[PDB]
Structure 1
Amino acid sequence: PGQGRNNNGLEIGCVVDAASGLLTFIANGKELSTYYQVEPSTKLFPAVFAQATSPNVFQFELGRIKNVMPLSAGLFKSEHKNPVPQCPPRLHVQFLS
């Protein structure tokens, strides 16, 4: 739907339910129609494909929303029951080279 494209930075939220292998997306507090169903034991890497049209392109935000654990909880087994979002030094950004 119709936005100003610039009132606030676009926030695309990715939600992964690993117990059911269901991938859903949120545009702006609004569930998107696109969804995916992955096969069991799939290992999914968060990914962004971008063609830069600005000095500032985008940013990963490793937070959480209501009733959902943060990404660090599933990434690290030591934080499997830690609701507080974390970005340990092991997690970093890689690019196709």
Structure 2
Amino acid sequence: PGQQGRISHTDLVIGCLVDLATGLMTFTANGKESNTFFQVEPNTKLFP
């Protein structure tokens, strides 16, 4: 939270991981696992 000192010199890096066999999608904030996850059916096409 940066309602104070909102400007951040640091650059954010969001990482997206997908397991094609399990159809599972997960995210990392700066190497820290995020709570959000998705599950997709087989044959799904996904674009970054």
Counterpart position of 2:37: 35
Change (3 A) 1:32 1:5: farther
Structure with the bigger percentage of helix: 1
Higher relative contact order (CA 8 A, sep 6+): 2
Moved over 6 A (4+): none
2:34 counterpart SS class: strand
Gaps of 5+ in 2: none
Gaps of 5+ in 1: 47-97
- The Cα RMSD (Å) is 1.7
Alpha-carbon distance between aligned partners in 2 of 1:5 and 1:38, rounded to the nearest angstrom:
36
Counterpart position of 2:23: 21
Percent identity of paired positions between Structure 1 and Structure 2? 58
TM-score (norm 2): 0.80
Counterpart position of 1:7: 9
